[PDB]
Amino acid sequence: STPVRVATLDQLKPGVPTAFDVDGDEVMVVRDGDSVYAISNLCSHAEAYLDMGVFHAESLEIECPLHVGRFDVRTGAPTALPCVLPVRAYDVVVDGTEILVAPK
């Protein structure tokens, strides 16, 4: 009603974060195994774009490229300084190989 289709699951390399426009909001999407996670692409610490940082599959953290703060991709929770405030997490469903993200 309606979500945003960003990509097909296998168009995403596992562990490689990308960003998509979801109804005006920029959203970082990343595959781990067969799971897909989505959070705001904008770091809460200062202006930086999380998809251009480093994804840590073992801990499910995205590391900001600018001051290397971290967020949990499952929840948007800040998990390493200097990030101290969470970013928005987006609900994601994979349906028939299509990755669908619920808009804000």
Residues that bind ligand FES (CB under 6 A): 43, 45-46, 48, 64, 66-67, 69, 82-83
- Residue 37 contacts residue 101 (beta carbons within 8 Å): no
Cα pseudo-dihedral 24, 30, 34, 37, rounded to 10: -60
Q: Annotation-wise, does 56 bind a ligand?
A: no
Distance CA 6, CA 56 (A): 22
The answer to whether residues 62 and 35 touch, using CB atoms and an 8 Å cutoff, is no
Q: What's the min distance (Å) between Cβ of 52 and ligand FES?
A: 10
Closer by beta carbon to ligand FES, 46 or else 93: 46
Whichever of 43 and 100 has its CB closer to ligand FES, that residue is 43
Annotated binding residues for [2Fe-2S] cluster, written as ranges, equal 43, 45-46, 64, 67, 69
